[PDB]
Homo-oligomer: A and B are copies of this chain.
Amino acid sequence: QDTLLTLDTPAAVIDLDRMQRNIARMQQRMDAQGVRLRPHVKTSKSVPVAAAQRAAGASGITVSTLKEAEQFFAAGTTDILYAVSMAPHRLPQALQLRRRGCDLKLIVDSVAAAQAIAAFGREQGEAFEVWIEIDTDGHRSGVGADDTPLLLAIGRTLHDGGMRLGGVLTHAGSSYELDTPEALQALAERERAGCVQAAEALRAAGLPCPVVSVGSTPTALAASRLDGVTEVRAGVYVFFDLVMRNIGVCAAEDVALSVLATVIGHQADKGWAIVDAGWMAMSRDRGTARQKQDFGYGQVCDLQGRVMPGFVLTGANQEHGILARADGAAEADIATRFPLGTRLRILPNHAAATGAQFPAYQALAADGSVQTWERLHGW
Interface on A for B, CB 8 Å cutoff?
A: 8-11, 42, 64-65, 84-90, 93, 109-110, 112-113, 116, 135, 138, 140-141, 173, 262, 264-267, 270, 274, 276, 279-280, 283-286, 317-320, 322, 339-341, 350, 352-353, 356-360, 377-379
Contact = CB atoms under 8 A, between A and B. Distances in A.
A90 B141 contact: no
Given A9-B87, A64-B280, 20 more contacts: A9-B89, A10-B379, A42-B318, A64-B319, A84-B264, A85-B320, A87-B264, A89-B262, A113-B340, A140-B322, A141-B265, A173-B317, A279-B353, A280-B356, A283-B283, A284-B286, A286-B286, A358-B378, A360-B378, A377-B377
Q: How many copies does the complex hold?
A: 2
A279 B262 CA distance: 28
A377 B358 CA distance: 7
A85 B10 contact: no
Contacts of A285: 279, 284
Contacts of A93: 8
Contacts of A357: 356, 378
Nearest to A133: B265
A353 B86 CA distance: 27
Q: Which of A93, A173, A279 has the most CB of B within 10 A?
A: A279
Contacts of A350: 284
Contact of A378 (B9, B110, B359): B359
Contacts of A353: 279, 284
Contacts of A270: 138
Contacts of A276: 84, 87
B341 A8 contact: no
A360 B378 CA distance: 9
A90 B319 CA distance: 15
A42 B319 contact: yes
Contacts of A340: 87-88, 110, 112-113, 116
A48 to B, nearest CB: 18
A13 to B, nearest CB: 13
